[PDB]
Structures are given as structure tokens and as C-alpha cells.
């Protein structure tokens, strides 16, 4: 500790988002001086364009130690526990293949120690016992895994609760032109701070880039991360319709989509499941020699007249017709795109930059990292301090050329928004 923890200054770029807010939290909890920690975001915490700024996210149960460590904190941490809604989760499958995959997943969870809280549902009867709001006609031939531990996360409220703690402790903040990263400040091969769009300079000993889907746009990542959009929309229930779904399990079918119990206002959110969309644009990230075609997020917060593609509407209507056939005439409203960045292998990118000393990447969220909100900052702090477990250091390493992130671990290469009509309502 060249400076000690107490004397180390750290800038967290994207500190209004999932990984960034977690990092700031763990710096303060670890004993960094709060006023030595600066959170920079394009938008105030919880950032309007953060993938974590939503009513709800699912808690994926999986045979993953990092996810397990996060799940413990969602159950027990004084800050996080109140934002976890343990309603259970139903993972459903149909066809003689998706069912084979689900059976292998089930066996994997049992092998890893989850036998007491995971159940195999081998028939329509068994599915309807766990989710009686479904309709037999729509689930013919389905099988499911029920995860008793499992549920949904009040995502924006969790990030806001972090923001309140950081403010109360004395963390420094910069937003808008004073928070929008433009470039690292480098000197003699070392990163010694950040410059924002408006020309404000911040000097620090270490800088973390936790800019989510914006990370490959801000600095040269050699296509390790490719940014893609997922879609959702909303339906409004009457008070009596809503009461039928109170504390109901999350339902997911990889072939269809997923949905959540209604919020306090009777609104259900419905998501597609698909390989995501790029939005290619010429852009020159810091460190690129010239402009290049990269997927650049089309931010709903900056372009609030945007919706989602016509093809996404078709798929979400199909999700509603399957899960919720009695609500098929309800309008789908507040349609929006949300952005994530995929790696080729779907693992995180948590590493020091190989040339810019003291600049650290904390991205590659790969569409499945909101569940890690409580724990991920601990790993980032351990990276800064040189104490991250070897296995995780290897898994999350700098790895350009390690495969094609446009397809990643998904079913197909993502299609581009330029080719998908229906979302753009600009002049
Ligand atoms: C539709 C949808 C459904 C999802 N469902 C789930 C789910 O059920 N379960 C799950 O675990 N995960 C889910 N996710 C994934 C999860 O939301 C993400 O993996 C995670 O939130 C990404 O965290 P992040 O910190 O990398 O990015 P973000 O939370 O998006 O944060 C990045 C931050 O960088 C900031 N930033 C951008 N540009 C700049 C700049 N120039 N300067 C400074 N700051 C900047 C942004 O404003 C933002 O606040 C879902 C995502 C989507 C899109």
C-alpha cells in the first residue's frame, strides 16, 4: 500500500450503475476515506441509463460461487436484504432438447448442493401447483424447475440505497458534463486521473472504468466486449387482477420470455428472451488510432421517444399470449431498450489495463450481473489491492482475440437496430 487504504484516492467511472456503485460501496466499507473516493457518472445515481435502474430484475439461481456469495448478501446484508423478494422462480421448458437441457441443469444444481430448495416438475399438474395463475392449455408438454430460493430484486431502489450511504459517508460526486468520462489522464505510462466532457480534471491514485455497455465506446477494448440491447414493456392490471399475482413466483421460459409480479401500481413488466441487438456507429474510443465501427448504446434516457423494434413487440405479445392469455388485449406500454455488454465467453472483464498502469476495467457484465450487485465491488477492491483469488483473476483477465463477442454464448450473432424497424420515433 504505497499510500495506505486511508490515503488512496480512487475514481469510479460509472459509479451510478451496478458494478460502479458496488465498487464505491466496498471501497467505503473496506476503510478507504470517503472523501478520497469520487463517483463520476453521466447521470445522477441511480443513473437513468443504468441497466440496474429498473423496477425488477430476476435472481438467477445457478451453480456459481460468486452468485452464491451475492445470494447470501441478498439474504443477510442490512443494506441489500430488504430489496430481495423471495417469491421463488419457475424455469420452464418445452421440446425434446430444451427439456434435456433443463434436466441437466437440474442435476447440476443438485450436485452443487441445492437439493433442499430445487424441485423438478414433471407435468402440467405439478407446474400449476406452483403457479396456479398459468393456464393448462398454454403449458402442454412443459416441464419445470422450481427454485424456492429465487425471486426478484428491487434494482433501482438498491442502487439508490447505495447512493444514500455514499452521500452520508462523504463520497464525492460528479454528474452530467462534470461526470461524463472523456479520457484517462496518462503521464509516463501511468493513469493519474480522468478528464470529463466539460474539461473538469480529477486526479487519483487508481481509476476504475465500470461504464457497462458504454465501456467499449469510452476506451479501446479490442472487441472483448460488444454492447447489445434487450427489451421490455409493461401491462396495467386492475387492483383485483393484480391481487391474483401478489407474491407469485418469477416465470421464465428461455424460448418465450419472462415476467414478474405487479409492482405497487399494478404493473407487470414483460421481457423477451433473444440474442440482443447491436447499434453500430462510427466512434473513436480513447486509445483507438482512428474511428471504427462499434456497437454504441442508443440510450432511452437521452432519447425517451424511442421504443423497441416491431419484432420485439411481436415476441412480447407472444409471451403474454402464453403466460397470461386473459390479458392479451392489454396495451403494452413504456416499451424500452436496456443495454449490456457481452464478452465472448460470457464471463466478466475485471482486470488492470495492460499498458495504462492503475487504470482498471470492471465490465463485461454479459446480461447477467445485476444479481452480483452486493458482492461485485468486493472483487474489484481486491483487484486494486492485488488480492483477487487466482481463479477469478484468470477468468476475468484481459483477453482480446479470445472469440467472437457478437455471438458470445448466445444462440446467434445479435442483429443490428438499423435493420430492425419500429423503435426510432425521431424527427
Ligand atoms: C432487459 C434486461 C434484463 C435483465 N435481466 C437481468 C436479470 O433478470 N438478472 C440479472 O442478474 N441481470 C439482468 N440484466 C443484466 C444486468 O442488468 C446487467 O448485467 C448489470 O446491471 C450491468 O451492470 P454494469 O455496472 O456493467 O452496467 P450499468 O448498470 O448499466 O452501469 C454503467 C454505468 O456507466 C455509466 N456511464 C456511461 N457512460 C459514461 C460516461 N461517459 N462517463 C461516466 N459514466 C458513464 C452509465 O450511466 C451507467 O450508470 C438485465 C439487463 C437487461 C437489459
Author numbering: 1 to 427
From the paper:
Hence, we set out to design mutations to enhance the catalytic activity of X02A, the most thermally-stable mutant of our library. In the first design (X02B), four mutations were introduced in positions that are directly facing the tunnel in order to match the residues found in PnFPOX (D60G, A61V, D62S, D368H). In essence, by reintroducing conserved tunnel-lining residues in the X02A sequence, we generated the X02B and X02C mutants and we tested their activity toward the same panel of substrates that were tested with the parent enzyme. It is worth noting that the X02B and X02C enzymes present limited activity toward the dipeptide (≈ 0.87 and 1.62 U/mg, respectively) compared to the WT (32.60 U/mg). However, while the WT significantly shows little, if any, ability to catalyze the oxidative reaction on the F6P hexapeptide (0.78 U/mg, which is equivalent to 2.4% of the activity on fVH), the X02B and X02C mutants feature significant activity also on the hexapeptide (0.18 and 0.43 U/mg, which are equivalent to 20.7% and 26.5% of the activity observed on the fVH). The comparison shows that X02B and X02C have significantly higher activity than AnFPOX-47 toward F6P. Moreover, X02B and X02C feature a much higher Tm relative to all the other L3-35A mutants, i.e. 60.17 °C and 64.02 °C respectively. The X02B enzyme features a wide and short tunnel (bottleneck radius of 3.0 Å and length of 10.2 Å), in between the WT and its parent L3-35A, while at the same time showing a similar activity on both small and larger substrates. Hence, the wider tunnel of X02B, while reducing the stabilization of small substrates (and, as a consequence, the catalytic activity towards them) allows larger substrates to access the catalytic site more easily, leading to comparable enzymatic activity.
